[PDB]
Amino acid sequence: RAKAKTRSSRAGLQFPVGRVHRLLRKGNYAERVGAGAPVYLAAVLEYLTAEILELAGNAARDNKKTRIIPRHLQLAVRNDEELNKLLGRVTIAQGGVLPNIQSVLLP
Amino acid sequence: RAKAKTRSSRAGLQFPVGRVHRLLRKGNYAERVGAGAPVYLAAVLEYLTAEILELAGNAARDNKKTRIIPRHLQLAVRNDEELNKLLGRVTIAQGGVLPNIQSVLLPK
Amino acid sequence: PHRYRPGTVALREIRRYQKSTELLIRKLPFQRLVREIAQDFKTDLRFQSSAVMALQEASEAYLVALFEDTNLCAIHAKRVTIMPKDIQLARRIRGER
Amino acid sequence: PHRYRPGTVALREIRRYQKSTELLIRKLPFQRLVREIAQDFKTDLRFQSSAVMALQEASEAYLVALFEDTNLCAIHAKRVTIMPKDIQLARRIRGERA
Amino acid sequence: CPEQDKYRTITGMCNNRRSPTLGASNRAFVRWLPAEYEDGFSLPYGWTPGVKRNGFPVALARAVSNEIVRFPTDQLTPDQERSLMFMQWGQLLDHDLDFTPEPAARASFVTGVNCETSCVQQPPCFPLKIPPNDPRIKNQADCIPFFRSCPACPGSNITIRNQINALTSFVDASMVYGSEEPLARNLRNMSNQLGLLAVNQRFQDNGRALLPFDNLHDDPCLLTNRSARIPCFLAGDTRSSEMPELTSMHTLLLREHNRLATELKSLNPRWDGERLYQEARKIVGAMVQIITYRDYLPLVLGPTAMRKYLPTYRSYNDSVDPRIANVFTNAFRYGHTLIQPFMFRLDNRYQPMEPNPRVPLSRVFFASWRVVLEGGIDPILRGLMATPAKLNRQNQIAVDEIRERLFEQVMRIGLDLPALNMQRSRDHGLPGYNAWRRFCGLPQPETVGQLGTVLRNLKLARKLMEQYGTPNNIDIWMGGVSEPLKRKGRVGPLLACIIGTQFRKLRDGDRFWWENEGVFSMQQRQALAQISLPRIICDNTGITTVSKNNIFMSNSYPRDFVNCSTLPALNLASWRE
Amino acid sequence: KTRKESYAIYVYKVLKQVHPDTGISSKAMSIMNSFVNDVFERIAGEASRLAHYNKRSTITSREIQTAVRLLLPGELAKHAVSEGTKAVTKYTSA
Amino acid sequence: KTRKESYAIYVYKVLKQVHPDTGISSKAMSIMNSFVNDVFERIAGEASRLAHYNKRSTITSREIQTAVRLLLPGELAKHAVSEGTKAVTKYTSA
Amino acid sequence: DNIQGITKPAIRRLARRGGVKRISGLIYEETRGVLKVFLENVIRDAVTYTEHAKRKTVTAMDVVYALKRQGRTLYGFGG
Amino acid sequence: RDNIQGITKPAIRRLARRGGVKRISGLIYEETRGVLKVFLENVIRDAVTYTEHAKRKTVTAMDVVYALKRQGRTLYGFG
DNA sequence: TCGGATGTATATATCTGACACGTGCCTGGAGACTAGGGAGTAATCCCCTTGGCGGTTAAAACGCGGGGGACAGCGCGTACGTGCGTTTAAGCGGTGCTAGAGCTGTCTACGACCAATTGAGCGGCCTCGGCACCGGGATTCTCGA
DNA sequence: TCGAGAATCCCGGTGCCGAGGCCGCTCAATTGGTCGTAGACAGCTCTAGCACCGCTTAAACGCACGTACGCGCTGTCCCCCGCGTTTTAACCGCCAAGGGGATTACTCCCTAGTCTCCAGGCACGTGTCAGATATATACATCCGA
Ligand SMILES: *[C@@H]1O[C@H](CO)[C@@H](O)[C@H](O)[C@H]1NC(C)=O
Ligand SMILES: *[C@@H]1O[C@H](CO)[C@@H](O)[C@H](O)[C@H]1NC(C)=O
DSSP, X not given: OXXXXXXXXXXXXXXXXXXXXXXXXXXXXXXXXXSSHHHHHHHHHHHHHHHHHHHHHHHHHHTTOSSBOHHHHHHHHHTOHHHHHHTTTEEETTOOOOOOOOTTXXX | OOOOOOHHXXXXXXXXXXHHHHXXXXXXXXXXXXXXXXXHHHHHHHHHHHHHHHHHHXXXXXXXXXXXXXXXXXXXXXXXXXXXXXXXXXXXXXXXXXXXXXXXXXXX | OOOOOTTSHHHHHHXXXXXXXXXXXXXXXXXXXXXXXXXXXSSXXXXXXXXXXXXXXXXHHHHHHHHHHXXXXXXXXXXXXXXXXXXXXXXXXXXXX | OOOOOTTSHHHHHHHHXXXXXXXXXXXXXXXXXXXXXXXTTSSSOEEOHHHHHHHHHHHHHHHHHHHHHHHHHHHHTTOSEEOHHHXXXXXXXXXXXX | OOSOOOSOOTTOTTSSSSOTTTTOSSEEOBOSSOOOOSSSSSOOTTSSTTOEETTEEOOOHHHHHHHTTOOOGGGOOEEXXXXXXXXXXXXXXXXXXXXXXXXXXXXXXXXXTTTTTOOOSOTTBOOBOOOTTOSSOOOTTOOBOOBOOOBSSOSSTTSOOOBEEOSOSSOXXXXXXXXXXXXXXXXXXXXXXSOOOOOOSSOOBTTBOOOOBOOOTTXXXXXXXXXXXXXXXXXXXXXXXXXXXXXHHHHHHHHHHHHHHXXXXXHOTTSOHHHHHHHHHHHHHHHHHHHIIIIIGGGTTOHHHHHHHSOOOOOOOSSSOOSOBHHHHHHGGGGGTTOOSEEEOBOTXXXXXXSOSEEEGGGTTTOXXXXXXXXXXXXXXXXXXXXXXXXXXXXXXXXXXXXXXXXXXXXXXXXXXXHHHHHHHHHHTOOOHHHHHHHHTOOOOOSHHHHHHHHTOHHHHHHHHHHHSSGGGOOHHHHHHHSOOOTTOSSOHHHHHHHHHHHHHHHHTOTTOTTSBTTBOTTHHHHXXXXXXHHHHHHHSSOOEEEOSSTTTOOOTTTTEEETTTSOOOOOGGGOO | OOOOXXXXXXXXXXXXXXXXXXXXXHHHHHHHHHHHHHHHHHHHHHHHHHHHHTTOOXXXXXXXXXXXXXXXXXXXXXHHHHHHHHHHHHHHHO | OOXXXXXXXXXXXXXXXXXXXXXXXXXXXXXXXXXXHHHHHHHHHHHHHHHHHTTOSEEOHHHHHHHHHXXXXXXXXXXXXXXXXXXXXXXXXX | OOGGGSOHHHHHHHHHHHTOSEEOTTHHHHHHHHXXXXXXXXXXXXXXXXXXXTXXXXXXXXXXXXXXXXXXXBXXXXX | OOGGGGSXXXXXXXXXXXXXXXXXXXXXXXXXXXXXXXHHHHHHHHHHHHHHHTTOSEEOHHHHHHHHHHHTOEEESOO
């Protein structure tokens, strides 16, 4: 037969198209799953992951640390209005809290 | 053959067993649905409906009215702690609000 | 000249409106506002009358809950009158800001 | 000797604790409390260490959020000291005791 | 100006109510950072030999362009997601926001020592000094011509010298509509009340329009080759005829204006000529803004950079300065790296056009006759659509065609675009690369290792340190280009920051933004959002096959090319009134 | 028109079982139908997710009972569970 | 041991594409895996609801696009939508 | 300027139902703003739902769908 | 076993300082302990029920994560 | 404290249209099978949980001193609730028009499904460097003159 | 402004355990056809939403006012903070028993699927009776006196 070519290579994405399609089909979401839905879902997931990873890397570089730790992840997520709105009710383990103090409490 | 009896009659339930089973099967909830799950669901739904409707009827009788209007249903739902917890984020149309005033705002 | 002292017929209105279940927002202005807001997203939009009614009911419920929470904040602040800061604080605590 | 005025080292502690990501509740007392609480639901229950850690993180996050809201209420009430009525009001507004 | 106006002025006057001078033409550039001149009043670095920049000697722009950007042209790597249309639209957009004037050689024949021929270092001449071992010119006495930028406020050496902006700061499609009232008056015909723009009366392309001819004392178009006798085209910018691709883009815009005016006259015959022209200008400006902010910016900054620097539009804000930043002029010229050594021409089958389908860029600059007498703009547009752009690589910064043999036919010797850009940056006296990194908030490298870490290439860091010595001595253009690319973008983080900030300032400060309430009817924006570049090329150009949405990305045939009929036409039924 | 199935006669039957005299208006009919649909959807979704957690592809009475215990708060849940058990028993004997 | 499936390799590939030198930790890997699983679950649930919701038995690109537009707030959604479209377009090409 | 259609007596009546005795003069502007924000969110969700179904009429069924999505599910208007 | 005192007063003080509290009263600790007990009771009940269904005698971290997700406080970092 | 003023729950007619009922019809729920695989149940492996030991020392508990702010008077400007006179579109009720929501009938191309193939990713096993810890010096904010 | 002082911040060596990379291989993704049907598309219809149009009239608007209240100022003291000291057990590092999570094989019983048919549930059409709507009455309740 023809040489194997992963669906991620065809779509140009890095996330697994086949795994997403299998999860959608076997996730009890719909009786049938279209051939274009998993590619779109993988693209959206990859874009969101790239956004969060880039913000976390920026925060880590600002903190003079090479490796990304959950504190950097929380600093990146909570400092972005859109991402904060998305993860409104999500607690990140060992994430800490944004450094802030009320104006009146200051001397 | 034999006389056809609805599955709700065997379980002694006033709610439809067959309709609940069909909804569970075709709602893409699970690949396979057991036989006892629709009957259990029908019993739970019947008990919940009976409780809320009994409270609504009590409220309507307290209001000197025969028919049950949405105001009576809202009063029955909110005046019961467990049902209030169950429907905490549920808004009933034309339900109003329980009559209450803070103690400080009372004239004195 | 029988003039009620400030704060009596206000409580009468509170009791009357809590005892009733009508709609406190006039239907036509709310429908016009809904149409104006919706037309910013898709022109030539048609709204069912039930759609305006449901939107009005949801809006009234949300506003009543917000006003109740604002009154609670104002009473906590050792005050009777509600202020915009109370509304802002209630919205911030609720998780909408 | 050197005696810092009241309200000074409190701000330093606030700045230090908002910069770190450690766990503020001691591990063993929290684990024992979790075991005691679960004792009322099923006898002879074994807890994974990861489960206890996740419970501790969730409890810490919830308590921190509650304290933030209570501080907001207190600063609204023209006060800088948090009082239990502020905690009760914050819980009522958030929708837990309502 | 009157408070009740709904069309932009030609000069952009009183665009901002608080300050009428904001964004107006013939005004000084705004400076984000304080000037970094040589003596602190008015002098470029390298003017006086022996003076060091922050303790390190300054490097010649030609010297740093010889060994940093130059790479063999046989190892070109085409960009698989960038079309030549992308670079062309970038250049066209740059031709709208800024144009730094220079003193004329004829007017400076007495004291300006005709810098185009001689290179004695007297004002306003700033010649590029030459290093040894130069591949092109082995003689050290030679000199690349360069003209000092015109000052803003002439006078004593009391204030830091600025630069004058000769174009409207706002994005109002000024590249083909002009920027001054005398320029706009003769740019539109008054023979009737149709409201159309000027159309050439000598040569036509298959019954379609072209830019009107222009007459100048020393026309560079005539110097291409004397057998042509085709003059330079006239448009909203003097350099509209610099390249045939740019003038074909201007031809497309002019044809779009003419077609829109004709369609509006057909829809509303009662409207007068001036009203029709103003309406067409407004719609074309909204078109240009929509295309730039929907199809071009997402393909430049990247999803992260655009989302961080270009948030959703809330409302018009009059507190933001809409003037062109002095660093934007030298930062948006990154498109020189995306250029290609050859210009391509294709047929309706998208196949090479005889006799010269792949022409070197050396024999194409200031060639107005190619558009007029070699098939028109159809093959040029086809080549721009179906030719991949050159990928921006650290060791492949820019091709040698624009680096060694640019403007060869016009001037006595060929110029060097990268060294020209760096010399312009030094003339404007903008701070170093490190200072701009500090301004954008990014980390500021100080040693060789830190520079290699931030640029992700130790070899290029060593190459840069061999010339500049310190990161603070790096010019803005080289530092911006040499930075690693973003995700799904084409510029470095510093260039992304600068471009995003400037475009956010231009959008927020624009009182005539297409999304701003009042400027456009609340129902017309839905019809305007359906416009797209390939559809309008289909409408105003004889070709029948174009690219899909986001034309700057599709660069293959016939994998992602569709017919004209599929694209939805622009609906103007809401302009009936 | 077309058949639009909804819990209409079942709520009335429950009312007749509980209150032999009082009726119920159309708006309260719609409210009861919406409440029944919402509770059914919540319990079914909880059961589906809970069965998905244990890698079991079949929803049985145990999953529904656990979902009811998780979702309904307080004494209600216990009563509901008891009722459900009885129903299942009436199937097993008959 | 069994083969448990996680998104570690894909998230690491994305990080390497974005930051060629920055590394990641095990806790951050677990956090990203949980986040991607949660977002995928939310989008798939919204799409399943929408598919069942207009009486359709299939999930297409339109359902996923509408779910992304509904869930993701603000500019993010638009960008995501564009990205999604682009991906589908490539499958159309090849 | 249509948001003024929410008259000051209407907001006063809503607050009276909520249980408010005294209302400041600056409350009305904030109430109008909050109402506009909430209506914008709900209407955007409903409009997206309607656009998905290739329909030009936004029904009440889609409105209660959007309210349920937002976490403010409403009864008495369908499901 | 009166083990609710395991959360000491300095622990609640540290939590408040993390939250951004400058002055803490003396009657807050009882309320904080009560709130923590209520929240732990709810989450533990949900997790214990989840474990009860699966016929297991060990409450894994996955059950606690699922209970938190159901409660509306989804927790990342454990699966 | 008691007579007058306003508001309203209450008892009494009087229409009224909403609903509970009766009925014809439709479609899907149920009876009666067949068939295959989900998982119930033994049976086994070894992972990680619990209980225990003992030493260090970080942390909690307790008490003393003091200061600042929570709270209660006290008063002053003000603004907004209350009522009256004027103005206004909301609501109602009809009327007409046509946009499109919904339904039905055809047809196709798109996804579920099955079989053979093979390689992408996961578990195990490494090897090394980023950082937590350790120490010492420079910087800075606080506080008493 | 101007010194002491204590905490915080900035650099130099240490090495260690977790992260990145490599190696088998196996189970899941791919390719290549097949076929049934869910959705796209064309056409029709007839709800039902949209656009004036006139008449009331409850409601909104605008204004006079004065009184309760928001807010500012001030005095007390006592509760909480800072800190020094002593006591408590948290924590760290092995160490062992084993309950139970986790995995695997047989099979058998239950649920998917199909054919049929008949009865429950729905939409129709309706007549009446809770209920909304006037109307006078007697309390319910508030404001100087
Ligand atoms: C000179 O220009 C004319 C323009 O018509 C062109 O035809 C001719 O080929 C050119 N000659 C050369 C030598 O380039
Ligand atoms: C305009 O932008 C400035 C910052 O440039 C900001 O401070 C200001 O609030 C903005 N104005 C509005 C009306 O948003």
